[PDB]
Structures are given as C-alpha cells and as structure tokens.
Amino acid sequence: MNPSTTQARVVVDELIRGGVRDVVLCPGSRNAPLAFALQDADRSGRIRLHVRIDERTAGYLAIGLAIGAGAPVCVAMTSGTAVANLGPAVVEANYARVPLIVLSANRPYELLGTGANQTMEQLGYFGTQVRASISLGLAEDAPERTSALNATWRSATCRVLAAATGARTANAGPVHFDIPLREPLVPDPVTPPGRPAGKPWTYTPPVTFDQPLDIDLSVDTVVISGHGAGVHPNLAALPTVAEPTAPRSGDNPLHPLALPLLRPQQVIMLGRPTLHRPVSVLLADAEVPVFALTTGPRWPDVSGNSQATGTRAVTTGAPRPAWLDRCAAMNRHAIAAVREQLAAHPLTTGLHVAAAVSHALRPGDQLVLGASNPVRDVALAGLDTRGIRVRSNRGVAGIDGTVSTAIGAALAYEGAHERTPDSPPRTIALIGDLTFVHDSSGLLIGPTEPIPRSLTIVVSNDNGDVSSRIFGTPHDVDVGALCRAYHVESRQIEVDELGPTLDQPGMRVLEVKADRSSLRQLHAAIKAAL
Amino acid sequence: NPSTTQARVVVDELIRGGVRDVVLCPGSRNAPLAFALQDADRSGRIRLHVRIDERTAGYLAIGLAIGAGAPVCVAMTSGTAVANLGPAVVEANYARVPLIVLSANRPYELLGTGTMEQLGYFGTQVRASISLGLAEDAPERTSALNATWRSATCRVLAAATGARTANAGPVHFDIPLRETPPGRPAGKPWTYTPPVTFDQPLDIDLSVDTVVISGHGAGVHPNLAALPTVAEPTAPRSGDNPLHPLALPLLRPQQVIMLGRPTLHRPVSVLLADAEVPVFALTTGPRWPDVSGNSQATGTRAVTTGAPRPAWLDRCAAMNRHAIAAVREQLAAHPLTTGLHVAAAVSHALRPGDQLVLGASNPVRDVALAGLDTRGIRVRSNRGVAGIDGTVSTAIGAALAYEGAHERTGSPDSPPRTIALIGDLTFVHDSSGLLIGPTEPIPRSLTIVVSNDNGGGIFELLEQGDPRFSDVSSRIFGTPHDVDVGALCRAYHVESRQIEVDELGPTLDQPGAGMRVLEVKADRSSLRQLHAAIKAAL
Amino acid sequence: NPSTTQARVVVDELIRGGVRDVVLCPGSRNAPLAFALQDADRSGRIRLHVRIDERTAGYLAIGLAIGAGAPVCVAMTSGTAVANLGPAVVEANYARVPLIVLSANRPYELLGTGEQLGYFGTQVRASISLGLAEDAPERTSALNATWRSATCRVLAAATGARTANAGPVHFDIPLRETPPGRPAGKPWTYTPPVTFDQPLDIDLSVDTVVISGHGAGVHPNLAALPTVAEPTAPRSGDNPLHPLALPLLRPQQVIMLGRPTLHRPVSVLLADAEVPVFALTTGPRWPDVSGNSQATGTRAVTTGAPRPAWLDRCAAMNRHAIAAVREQLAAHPLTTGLHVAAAVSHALRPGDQLVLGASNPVRDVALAGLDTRGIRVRSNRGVAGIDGTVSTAIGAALAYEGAHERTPDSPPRTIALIGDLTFVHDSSGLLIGPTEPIPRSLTIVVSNDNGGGIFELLEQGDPRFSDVSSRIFGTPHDVDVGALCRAYHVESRQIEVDELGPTLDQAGMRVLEVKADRSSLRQLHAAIKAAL
Numbered sequence A: 001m002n003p004s005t006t007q008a009r010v011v012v013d014e015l016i017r018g019g020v021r022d023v024v025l026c027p028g029s030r031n032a033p034l035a036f037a038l039q040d041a042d043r044s045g046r047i048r049l050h051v052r053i054d055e056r057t058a059g060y061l062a063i064g065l066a067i068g069a070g071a072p073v074c075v076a077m078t079s080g081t082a083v084a085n086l087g088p089a090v091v092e093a094n095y096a097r098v099p100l101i102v103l104s105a106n107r108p109y110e111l112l113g114t115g116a117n118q119t120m121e122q123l124g125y126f127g128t129q130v131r132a133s134i135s136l137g138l139a140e141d142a143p144e145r146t147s148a149l150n151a152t153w154r155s156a157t158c159r160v161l162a163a164a165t166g167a168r169t170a171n172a173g174p175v176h177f178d179i180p181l182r183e184p185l186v187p188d189p190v191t192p193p194g195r196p197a198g199k200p201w202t203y204t205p206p207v208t209f210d211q212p213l214d215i216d217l218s219v220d221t222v223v224i225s226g227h228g229a230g231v232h233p234n235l236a237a238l239p240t241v242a243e244p245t246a247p248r249s250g251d252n253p254l255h256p257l258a259l260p261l262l263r264p265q266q267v268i269m270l271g272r273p274t275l276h277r278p279v280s281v282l283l284a285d286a287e288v289p290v291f292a293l294t295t296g297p298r299w300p301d302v303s304g305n306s307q308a309t310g311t312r313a314v315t316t317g318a319p320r321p322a323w324l325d326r327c328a329a330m331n332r333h334a335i336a337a338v339r340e341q342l343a344a345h346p347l348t349t350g351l352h353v354a355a356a357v358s359h360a361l362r363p364g365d366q367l368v369l370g371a372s373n374p375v376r377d378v379a380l381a382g383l384d385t386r387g388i389r390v391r392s393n394r395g396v397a398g399i400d401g402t403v404s405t406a407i408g409a410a411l412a413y414e415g416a417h418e419r420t421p422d423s424p425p426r427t428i429a430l431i432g433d434l435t436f437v438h439d440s441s442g443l444l445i446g447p448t449e450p451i452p453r454s455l456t457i458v459v460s461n462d463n464g465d466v467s468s469r470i471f472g473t474p475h476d477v478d479v480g481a482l483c484r485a486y487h488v489e490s491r492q493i494e495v496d497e498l499g500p501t502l503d504q505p506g507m508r509v510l511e512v513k514a515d516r517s518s519l520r521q522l523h524a525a526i527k528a529a530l
Numbered sequence B: 001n002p003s004t005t006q007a008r009v010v011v012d013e014l015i016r017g018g019v020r021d022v023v024l025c026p027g028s029r030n031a032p033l034a035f036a037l038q039d040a041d042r043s044g045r046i047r048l049h050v051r052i053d054e055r056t057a058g059y060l061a062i063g064l065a066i067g068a069g070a071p072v073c074v075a076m077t078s079g080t081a082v083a084n085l086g087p088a089v090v091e092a093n094y095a096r097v098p099l100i101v102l103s104a105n106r107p108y109e110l111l112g113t114g115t116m117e118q119l120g121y122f123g124t125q126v127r128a129s130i131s132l133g134l135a136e137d138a139p140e141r142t143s144a145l146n147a148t149w150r151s152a153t154c155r156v157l158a159a160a161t162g163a164r165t166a167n168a169g170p171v172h173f174d175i176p177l178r179e180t181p182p183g184r185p186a187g188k189p190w191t192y193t194p195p196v197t198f199d200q201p202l203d204i205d206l207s208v209d210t211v212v213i214s215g216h217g218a219g220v221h222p223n224l225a226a227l228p229t230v231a232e233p234t235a236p237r238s239g240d241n242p243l244h245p246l247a248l249p250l251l252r253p254q255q256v257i258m259l260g261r262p263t264l265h266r267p268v269s270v271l272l273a274d275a276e277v278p279v280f281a282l283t284t285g286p287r288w289p290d291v292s293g294n295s296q297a298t299g300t301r302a303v304t305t306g307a308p309r310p311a312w313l314d315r316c317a318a319m320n321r322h323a324i325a326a327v328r329e330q331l332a333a334h335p336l337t338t339g340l341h342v343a344a345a346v347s348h349a350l351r352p353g354d355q356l357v358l359g360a361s362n363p364v365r366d367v368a369l370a371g372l373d374t375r376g377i378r379v380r381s382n383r384g385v386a387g388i389d390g391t392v393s394t395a396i397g398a399a400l401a402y403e404g405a406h407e408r409t410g411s412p413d414s415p416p417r418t419i420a421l422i423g424d425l426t427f428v429h430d431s432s433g434l435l436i437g438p439t440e441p442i443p444r445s446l447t448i449v450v451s452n453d454n455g456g457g458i459f460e461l462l463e464q465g466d467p468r469f470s471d472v473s474s475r476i477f478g479t480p481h482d483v484d485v486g487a488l489c490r491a492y493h494v495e496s497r498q499i500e501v502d503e504l505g506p507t508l509d510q511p512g513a514g515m516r517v518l519e520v521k522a523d524r525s526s527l528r529q530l531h532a533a534i535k536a537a538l
Numbered sequence C: 001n002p003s004t005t006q007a008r009v010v011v012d013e014l015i016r017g018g019v020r021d022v023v024l025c026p027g028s029r030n031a032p033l034a035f036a037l038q039d040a041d042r043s044g045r046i047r048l049h050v051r052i053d054e055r056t057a058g059y060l061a062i063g064l065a066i067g068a069g070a071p072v073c074v075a076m077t078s079g080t081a082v083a084n085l086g087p088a089v090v091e092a093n094y095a096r097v098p099l100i101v102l103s104a105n106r107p108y109e110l111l112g113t114g115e116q117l118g119y120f121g122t123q124v125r126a127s128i129s130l131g132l133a134e135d136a137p138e139r140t141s142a143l144n145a146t147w148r149s150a151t152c153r154v155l156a157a158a159t160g161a162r163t164a165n166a167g168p169v170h171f172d173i174p175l176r177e178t179p180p181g182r183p184a185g186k187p188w189t190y191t192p193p194v195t196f197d198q199p200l201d202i203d204l205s206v207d208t209v210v211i212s213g214h215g216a217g218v219h220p221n222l223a224a225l226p227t228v229a230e231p232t233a234p235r236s237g238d239n240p241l242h243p244l245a246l247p248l249l250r251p252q253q254v255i256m257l258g259r260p261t262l263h264r265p266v267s268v269l270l271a272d273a274e275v276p277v278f279a280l281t282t283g284p285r286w287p288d289v290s291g292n293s294q295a296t297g298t299r300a301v302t303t304g305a306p307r308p309a310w311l312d313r314c315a316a317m318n319r320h321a322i323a324a325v326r327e328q329l330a331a332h333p334l335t336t337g338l339h340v341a342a343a344v345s346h347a348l349r350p351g352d353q354l355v356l357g358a359s360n361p362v363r364d365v366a367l368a369g370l371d372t373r374g375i376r377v378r379s380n381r382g383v384a385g386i387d388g389t390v391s392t393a394i395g396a397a398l399a400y401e402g403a404h405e406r407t408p409d410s411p412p413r414t415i416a417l418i419g420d421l422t423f424v425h426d427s428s429g430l431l432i433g434p435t436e437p438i439p440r441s442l443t444i445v446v447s448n449d450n451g452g453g454i455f456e457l458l459e460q461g462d463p464r465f466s467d468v469s470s471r472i473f474g475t476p477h478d479v480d481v482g483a484l485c486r487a488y489h490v491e492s493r494q495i496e497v498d499e500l501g502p503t504l505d506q507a508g509m510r511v512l513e514v515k516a517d518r519s520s521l522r523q524l525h526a527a528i529k530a531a532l
C-alpha cells in the first residue's frame, strides 16, 4: 500500500472514530487519496458522503450538516483556490461556533515557490478564523515506521477533531487540516489499525465549563437570548426576548417590539444577541446593568455596561408579580398589533409569508431561515419556537450558501432520525428571492448523491451609496427556471395554500409571490398600533 | 469635509494612473471612496460594475485587468468580502494581475472584540498594503495633504502594475474613515515612473538540439523564433515553428529554453525534470519556475550563438505534423463528440483580433492539442492557480475591457469578438456570474462556448480514469450533475442555444446578443479511448 | 484632551485588574499611556520599571508575572520593540504567562510606505485596539464604559479568566499627536472563577507512575503515587521517584501532568506504545510524545490502590538512584555544575523562590533530588531559552518580594541558578538605574564551567568529536565574570562549592560565581550510569 493511500485511510478512519458521520467532497486530482478512502467508507455505511461541484456553497452544506445534528463535519477539496473558496463558510463557522473541518489536500510543501501548477500559500490561509491550522506532513515511504506514523497521524487527527468540536475549550469552530500528498495518489494495483473497540486514538471527553454568577431576580429583569444561548431553567419564568435560533428556556415570551415600551432595571443576556435593533438600543444604554451568560469563553461586547460574565446564574429573590404582569400584557399588546395590521394590510408581504410559515410548523419540525429579513420577519410574527429546531447562519449573517445550509440541515436531521421508525421529520426553509437566486446553485445535487427526504424551501419572492443602484431595479430572475436548471421540483403558490401544501407529504421549492412596495406602510401601521 | 476631499483626490489619481474600471458590491457599510467613484462614473472618467456575488466580483476584476492590461480596483463593503475576494487575489498574485483591493477601516471603532474580517492570505499574496491615514481637517495644509495622498496613490498603482519591480499583482489600499486640489498638469501622474528594464542575459548555444517551452507570462524572444516551440495558448508566440506537445516525447532534445511559467502537459514536466537536459528559464519578472530543481540558469533574455541543425529542425517539424494529423484523423474517426472536438471547432472559427478566454481543465489543454495558431489572437486563462472558479466573470470582464479598449481607439468598426471555451463544471461553478443588472455594463460581443460532457472529463485521462477504477471513479471524479444549462441561461435572461459541434463554427460566425452561451453536449465516457487512439496514431 | 482621559481610564482599569507592575523602555515616540502610567506610579497605585535593552525588558515583565502570578504590561515605544520583545512573547505563549503588550498606533499617518513581524498572529491570545478617543463630552459615560470593558477584555484574555489558558495579548490604544470605574474598586466587567472539568477514569491498582512537568496541576488523589517531578512542577504528595530510577522500572501506565520537557528516560517512557499515558492538564492544550496519549483530562477519578510491592520497589529504586548520584558526586575529584546544583538544593528553605536557568542547571537540580515542597520554582520552560534569565530572576524577585511586603519580616530569598552561557546572554539585565526598583533578597548563582556543559552529555560529546565539538558545542568564552559585575556596580564574589550554603545565609542584588569543570562531566555522568 503506497504512502498516500495508507495515510488517507488512517486519517479517514480516525475521523469516523471521532464522530464524523457526514463528509462533503469536492473533486480534484490532488485529493484523490482522500476521495478514495471516503468513497469506500461511504460504501460500507461508515459515513454519508456528499459530493458537490462548488467549494464555497459546499462549505455551507457542511455547516448545515453540522448544525442539523450537532456533529463535526469535514469538507474535503483539492489544492489551490478550491481551499480559498472555503473562506466564507469558515468565517461563518468561526462566529457561529460550528465544528467544520476543512480537510484540504496539498502538494508537498517542498514545491511551494517552485511555480508548480495549482500551488499556493495554503497552510495558514485562514489565519485567525480557525481554531487551528494543522498540517499532517508528507507521508514517508518507510514500512518499518508504519506503527510510529500511525500513532502520529491518529493523534494529529484527534487534535483537529478536538479543536473543531471544542472538546476541551467549549468553543467549537472551523479547523484547517492540510494534507500534503504526492504521487502515487491512487491505490496501487491492510490499513494500520486504530484503538480497540472503535475508540478514538486520544480520548478526550466533552469538558464541563462552569462560571457561576450571582443575580438577584427581585430587581425588574428582562432576559435577552441570542444565537448560541444556553438553557437556563432558573430563568424560565422571566420575560424573555428570544431570537428565533435561541432555545426558549421558559414560557414567558416577550416580543421584541414590546421591549422599548418597558423599563427593565437589569438585563440578563444569553448567548450572542445579533438581530433586533431595539435589543441593541437597550444594550447600548450604558445605565442598565447587563449580565452575560454564555456557553463558551466568548461574550458579547454589545453592551458597554456588562457588569459580569458567566455560564449560569445563581439566583436569589424572585421577580415582582407586578413586573411579570406588565411585561406579559405588553407582549400580548405587541403581538396583537402585528396580527391585526397584517390582517388589515391588503397585499401579501414577506411578513405575511413569514407569519404563514410560522403557523404551519408543528413540534418536531426543523426550520431554517435566511439570515436577513426572514429571521427578522419570523421574529416579528411572534413565532413560538418551543419544540422546533430553528437554524440560521447568524455568525456573519451572510447571504452565501443559504440553500446549501438548509439542504445540509435537513440531511443531518433526517439521518439523526434514522438512527433510532416513523416518517422523517419536516425541514422547512424560508429564504428570500435574492438569497435564493444568489445560492441557487446550492440546489445542485448530483444524481448519485443523497437528496433530503423532507425538505421544503419556501421562497418569499418580492423581486428584490451607488453600490445600491442594483436594487433600484427588480432582477426578474425566473425562480422556476432556476429550479429547472438544478432539477428540483417547484411550484408557485399563494400564501394561504402554504399551510395545506406543506401538509401534503422529497425536496421541493414553493414560491410565494410577495409585494415589497407597501412594506413601509405595513411596518409604519404596526408601529402606530403599539 | 476632509474625507470627501481625500476620496476625490485618490480617485482622480487612480484615473490618472490608468484605472478605467472599478468593481463594487453592496455590503454592511459604504464602499471605500463610493461618492468619489460615483462622481467619476457619472462624468464618464471611470466605469463602475456592481455585483451581489463578492467572489464573482473579484474575478470580474481579474477579467477587467487582463483584457487590456490596466490596473483594476475592487471596493470592499462587507465582512465576507475578504473571504470571497481570496480566490481572485491569489490568482492575481500568481498570474501577475494588477488588482487593487480598496478598504475603509474605521480608526474610531473597537477592534478585536468581535468591518474587516482578516484571514491569513493578505500577508502572503499582496505586493503592498498601504494605508492613507485619516483625513485631517487642516485647510492651511491642503497643498501638502494633496501631495501626500497623490504620492501614496501612485505608490499603490506602481506596486500593482509592477512599475518598478516588473512583478504586477494584488495590492491592498486602505483609506480610513470617520463616520478638488489639482493633480499634475496635462493629466500626468503625481509621481511618474518611467519604463524600467530588468536585464539578465544568458549565453545559450543554439547548435545544441533545443526545444522551447513557453508557458504563462512568457516574453517575446525574436532570437528564439526559429526554434521548435511547445507553446501554451496564453504564451505569446515569437515565431513560426510550432511543436505539438504530443510530439515532444517522440523527440530527444539536448537542451530546453523555458519561457514564463508552464503548467500544461505531463510530457512537458517530464522533460523539464530530466537531469540530463539543461533547462534555461527566461522570465519577465523576478520569479522563475523549476521542475524537480532541474533549472541550470535563469535570465530575462538569451544571447545566442550558433544555429539549430537543419536535420533537427526538420525532424521536429515532421513529428509536429504527425501529432496534428493523428489528432485530426482520430477525431474524425471517433463516433461521439468530445470536448476535444469542440475545442478543435472553436480553434478553426477564430479570426485575428479575437480574444479567446480558456477555462481550466480540458479546454485549455484541448485547444493546444488541436494545434491552435494563437498568433493574432489574445488568449486569456487563469493559469495563476488554475481554478475552475470565477471563469464566467473573467470572460465577461475581459470582453468589457477589450471592447472598451477598442471603442476607445475611435475605429468605426464592430467591436472585436470575445469567445470563451469552458467546461460544464466550470460553467456551473461561476453560474452566478451571469446575473448582471440592467444598471451595469454588459459585453457587446461575448460568446461563451460551454463544452458539456456532464462532469469533469480531464479525470478520464488521469490515473483514476483507468478501467480498474470504473466502479468508484464515476461518483468522486466524474461528478455528473445533470444540469439543464438552457434553463439556467433562461433564468438569468441570457441568450443561449444548444448546437452540435459542426454547427459551432457557423453559429459563431453569425452574431446574436451581446452575451450568449453556446452549449455543445459532449461525451466523456469515450475520452480515454479517444486520447489512446491519438497516441497510438502518433 | 480625550486621549488623556482615555489613557487614565485604561490605566485605572488595568490597576483594578491586578496589574501592579509595568515595564517601559525609552523610544522614538512617546510611550503608550506614558503620562497616565507616570501619575499612577507617583501615587503608588502601580510600579514602573524602566530599561534600555528592550529584550531584557520583555523578560523582566515575564519575571514580574511569574513571581506572584499577576498580569504585567510592557510599553512598546520604538521600531525595534516588536523584534526585541519577540522572545519574551513566544515564552509567554508557551509557558502561559499573562503578558500585555501595549501599543499606540497613529491612524493619521501613512502605513506601508516605510514595525510588525510574523509572530503576533501565532502567539497572542487576543489583539484588541481601543480606537481613537472621540471629542464628545456628551457621551463621556458611554465612552468610559466602552474603554473599561475593552481593558477587562484584554485582562481576561491575558490571565485566562475564561479560557484557563493565560498568555500574551496585544493591546493597542491609538492616538493623534477622570470618569469613575465601579464602586469598591471592582473591575468593570467581573469574571468569576472558572472551572474546566474533564474527569478521567484511572485505575490505580495498575502499576502507575506520575510524571509532572511545567504547568502541572495539583492532585490530592494522586499524592501517594511514585512521581517523577520536574522542578517547576508542584508536588501533590511525598513519594518522589528519581528520573534515573525510571529506566530500570517497568510501569504499566503513566499519568502525565502539565508539560514535560526534561529527561530522556521520561520521553522513552511516554513514547512507549505499550504503556497507556493519561494527560492531565490545567489548560486546553495537552502534550504528546510520539502520539502515544490514550486520553486527556483535567483530573482523575480513581479506582483501586497501588500495590504495596510496586510502591516499595519504586521507593527502593528511588533511594538507589539518589544515593548513586550523591556517592558518585563525592567520589568525583572536580567541582561540576551538578555539584553546584546539589549545594544550592541543600541550602533551600521553605518560603524561598528558586529561579532556574535552562541547560544543565534545571536538569541537575532534579538529578540532585531537590525537595521542592514549600518552595516556588521558576524556569522559562515554555521555549527553554537561555536568553533573558537574569531579568527573569530579577522580576520574579521584585514581584515575589512585593507580594510578601503587602502582607513584617525581612523579604523572602530569591535564589537563581544559571550556567555561565545563560549569564552572559542576559548580562545587560544587570544594568539598572538608581531610579528603578531593585530586588532586596536576590542572589544569582552562576555555575561557570566556561561553556555549555550540557553538550558534553549528548551525542556530540562522544570522544570521537574531541577535535571539533569543543569549538562548536563547548563554546568557551574566558569571560571575567567578576569584572562584568563590577562594571554594572553589582555585588559579586567567586566562591567554592562548600561556601554556597553559608554565603546564602548572610546586599539586595548579588552574584555568586562558582568556577566549575565540564571537562569531566561526561565521565561523571557515566559513573552514575555505571553505578546504577
């Protein structure tokens, strides 16, 4: 067995032993040792392989596969710009804390500078965005040292996995794992074994990261939970303004529109609040003390008056019953204003589409939102997220790869369900037309590749500085033709067919035509009803 | 406002420096120098191109720079911009393209607490990173600040065009911001850089049986024009004695003159690696390539003694004829249409004055296998890193700049044609480069020929294309996708037609929309057999 | 001036964050926070230390941090400062030292037209810039809050307050050429104590040996196990295992604490594919020799008990090893570095701080079987450089003294043991102006064998390299150590090895030089191996 083949199979085996169940693969000659090894691991059921053409959107497919089931996901590609194309997904994975392993092939470092074709400054390309950039090193031709090389290769692989999952740091994130490979790259015309019982070479258990923080709940308190927030049972009774991706620890919801009309004496901040301007405006009021509770070492700088950080609260006291009544009444008032104006508005807007999707969902659903207006609109409509997994690329809230993220979240979620009978759970994506068109090529799944069992992509189509001149005109891109180009079933429907159509039992796109013209008066009328 | 003066001063100097096109994207915040650029665009002093896709925008800038050799600016607006600009910036570094990346950092705002998202590649790819510094409000010091700003902008331009280094490439230019003073007379740049020559003569004796291999970035060498030359399509041809790359292993050169950076043909890299063959590397810039460390000397031009043997010149010319005949005759006998057939058809239908944009993978090779005579043609390809990413926007930008050059010549004549030949994978990779708003510049004579064999044909020709891998190679190297290319063009309102290879020539001979896609369905399951028959007919 | 307000706020918050010492050098431009730092030093709120040599100033800051565990700042002022601070910053990263590097970039000036290197990207826990101070008194409260939280962020990353991985941080406060903090002196953003918990199941009935290196944690439930401890490694119990006993025993499993760097037998054991090695660390990083770590955690969950036979054999081989070193030392006719180390170990009392140079000194102190219980031991094991050790000793003594005097009695002793090459490397650290703080009970003991003794013990020390190894590895210098201490007005004395104990029992800063021999070092160590 030649060295490139041997090294690639040890690495793939250790990655599977480390809990990698899905791998995204992109084509190239230099990464042939990785592709062959990943191929026959897929053939023997060890992993699910996903081949894509476009490295950039492929990274967001890997992200989707990671957030959909919570497991580390590798994306493998060849040397050169194929590695650079992972930049966008790496930036998002860094801020969203996603265990994304960029498993790049390379030519031997000894050829960098020689002018060799398709060779670049690959190691360190991502700089500070990854948790680590680890090079495996060139596989030596030395049979007598096969047991030594097997130990170093496997140990390096667990380092990559641990950095990516935050096994010891509590801060998952992208890792660059660069594999210099040289010919022969294809199997020549047994692989060094790992630990017994399928154990990882270096076992590191998930650490428990604890920083208790004393907080008095008697002071009038509002909880604001953003992306990456944890669950806090002792904060469940408090009024909570929760982003759609934040897990609702309790059942005392507070609409984001209600918060500006309330006067909290202190704020408990869960995770990283990324979305609401009213949230930011209260946090930028330096005079209300903010307590930062996070699941990892990072904590948000959004308030300048963050008195303290921690992982959990040690609560004394109890919220004033009058305070709870007031906020609860303001929450119902805010959500009544939204629903009544929506019903009085004559035209279907993106908020109507968003409200319609939120009503269609049921516990067990997975909802994927494009990171601009859809996550805002769903939040405005007052989506009750208890019992449903909401996913969104809120690390940088970029537009790239949204379709691919939804396809990946569906696949990992469904596959988690077929490791337990009943019909696979529903994944419903809500993305706007510009984002859909922008990552429309993320729809492309090869005829030989896994197709989501139950993904429905709802496109809320409202047909849309001198750089902003390109929004001065509707693009008028034919959504149906786009889905035809990537052979995906599509149907243009109306907002009240949405509920029934979603209840109609593989992967499909439902396009709902929406008006953007009157959106200002819809929102103005909602501000007035408060 | 000091910042607003500063932007007009910089933009004026960028225009005086030869920048004719700037590419912007919508983003988190305002573009660097956006209002100054808008003023210049409205005045016709500069042409702006807006895209939503930051990755395709970077390669659009590549095309706008290589189509006519001008420095090109790209304006960053976002927190994914650096990431999306990465691939094109690396290509600009390796292909020596004058790409100016503009930023507007905010020195009054916090940093490191969570807009610039630095990666690691800027410190390895750019010729320079220059920051103007915040614009002081000091009306008294106006003449001095003007001089400082225009001097720095000239320094940015010189780094990008290689004015003093002969190594063009990407430059990071930052104009900081907190949220017109004249230049030189007669539109001359503030700091002038006259022609520079780097001269490294090498003594080479041409009586030794010599072959010339010219790759990307190769210079023109009149004293090597007689020698047998194995030229890449982007290599400018000095002379008259083409040597087909497939005739190379049927000859025994005693010495090789290497021009520029070759990246094509395994027989080229074998011969370049042959310890017994002296290899002389002639480049136009400070870098020089090697295969296996087998380069004996490196220079910029040759000082030649002697002449090649007649029998050696005849023998190469005969083997050249055999290779071309094997290709034409085996192609004719082949039952299915392949990408090599499409490339042969495109080559025949090319006229002088045309610009040819070649995608990576098989198209740039197949065009060489078809014996295309590139003289009179301007051939572009991203040989820098040989990506299949960004090729649609490279062809579009190259056609815009090449047509802009021609419209600027004042000639009352239809603009020259830009013909692109790319694979199906390459097309899908940069499909979103086809989305151009009506507000933006669109080519007037761009045709993109898409050779569609529903996957990556080049791998049928590699070791993983051997029949012993038939079971597994289809999925992980072939990567079929079944994309309806016609519908994809339909979606972006791009004229397209699906034709057979024999109709390709006449279709190219008749004009249509300014931007159009010609799709030729092709087969790759017989590609390995076809190439096998060519070698056996050699 | 908004910038002056900014600098004062930052210094005030750095004070509340436990920074008691700041190190400065004079430079082309004026130092960052220089005026605010001056007022703090005049008020006794902080203590300034000024040096000319920027490289020794970096290691002085390292010493001021490891001496009492406090965050220390260094004030960059020049175009050579980043280059000169490089060594210290790399050491601060690997040894996990809370070092804050202050910078003051000028955003109104051109950059890139004619002083960074490549190491800041790979070494620092964080790089944070404050941004220019806006002239807006309307928002004075909001700016005060923003500046103070950032400083807390810088302090948090430097001390490992949330990562459990202290290290160097780059803190930039730009400028162009006092609002209150929290009540009761509390930090603006308070980070309570953090635990990272990674329990490992360890069966102690299996013949187990403990190897503790730099940064090792304390483990009560492992106190009884035979423990091969490094000098800087805190001791959990009282069952020491000499490093020389290890190659004669056959442990069935190894518990590895912190980061070992010493002893070739330790590496062979940890690299043994048939011995499971469990790595217990206090931070996220973990070490491996030849990729032979079975698991990593922060603490052990123990089942079973070591076999009495196994304990007794290890303890027996400990006495065999230690007695063999002591006996071969007394039989040796010449004073060597090992002799000087043993003399120093015998002279140490609880409450002392012992600072150890690299090369033989830090190895010899273990071979001499120093009992480190009750003694703080410092060595720059992060990169094991022989650079900067004098100012590392000085800064550790200043900080250790400072901590004791914020409690009566005479300040505790700080005793340093360094080879001659180490001493000459950082000789400029002895240059201290009469305006600067000077330690009160610091004794630097230079074991001078006129070259690198450690290279006598390696492959290049074989007699077949007699002809060539003396120049390229021995590197003798013939330096007059006494004249060098005289030049800097440092108290010096050249004494024999049996004067060491008494002389250390008697000036605030003094050097004791003990002339030593490396000509016979290889034969001496051979005699110990022989008698083992």
Ligand SMILES: Cc1ncc(C[n+]2c([C-](O)CCC(=O)O)sc(CCOP(=O)(O)OP(=O)(O)O)c2C)c(N)n1
Pocket (backbone or CB within 6 Å): A027, A028, A029, A055, A078, A081, A082, A085, A117, A118, B263, B339, B359, B360, B361, B362, B363, B386, B387, B388, B389, B422, B423, B424, B425, B426, B427, B451, B453, B455, B456, B457, B458, B459
């Ligand atoms: C972004 C990116 N990602 C992956 C690669 C690797 N790659 C190539 C390479 O081998 C190119 C080598 C050369 O010198 O041209 S060539 C290739 C297949 C391209 O298929 P295609 O566009 O349909 O062309 P075809 O006619 O099928 O050869 C792939 C996937 C790449 N070059 N760029």
Ligand SMILES: Cc1ncc(C[n+]2c([C-](O)CCC(=O)O)sc(CCOP(=O)(O)OP(=O)(O)O)c2C)c(N)n1
Pocket (backbone or CB within 6 Å): C261, C337, C357, C358, C359, C360, C361, C384, C385, C386, C387, C418, C419, C420, C421, C422, C423, C447, C449, C451, C452, C453, C454, C455
């Ligand atoms: C700045 C620098 N430059 C070179 C080295 C290499 N080096 C060392 C090494 O071998 C280090 C080994 C260890 O783990 O301590 S040890 C060493 C000799 C030190 O001589 P010394 O101070 O007189 O010690 P001695 O007691 O004579 O062994 C040298 C030259 C270094 N460590 N740092």
Ligand SMILES: O=C(O)c1cc(O)c2ccccc2c1O
Pocket (backbone or CB within 6 Å): A094, A095, A096, A097, A227, A228, A229, A271, A272, A294, A295, A296, A298, A299, A300, A301, B113, B114
């Ligand atoms: O809590 C989280 O998950 C989280 C994640 C992040 O990526 C952050 C980035 C900067 C600042 C705070 C962050 C944060 O609190």
Ligand SMILES: O=C(O)c1cc(O)c2ccccc2c1O
Pocket (backbone or CB within 6 Å): A113, A114, A115, A116, B093, B094, B095, B096, B216, B217, B218, B260, B261, B283, B284, B285, B287, B288, B289, B290
């Ligand atoms: O000749 C050229 O244009 C050229 C361009 C490059 O990007 C090179 C990179 C490495 C080594 C040689 C190179 C080279 O010779």
Ligand SMILES: O=C(O)CCC(=O)C(=O)O
Pocket (backbone or CB within 6 Å): A029, A030, A079, A107, A117, A118, B458
């Ligand atoms: O596919 C090819 O032939 C070129 C790609 C290459 O050289 C590589 O393996 O990196």
Ligand SMILES: [Cl-]
Pocket (backbone or CB within 6 Å): B251, B252
């Ligand atoms: Cl021959």
Ligand SMILES: [Mg+2]
Pocket (backbone or CB within 6 Å): B423, B424, B425, B451, B452, B453, B454, B455, B456, B457
């Ligand atoms: Mg193809």
Ligand SMILES: [Mg+2]
Pocket (backbone or CB within 6 Å): C419, C420, C421, C447, C448, C449, C450, C451, C452, C453
């Ligand atoms: Mg010595």
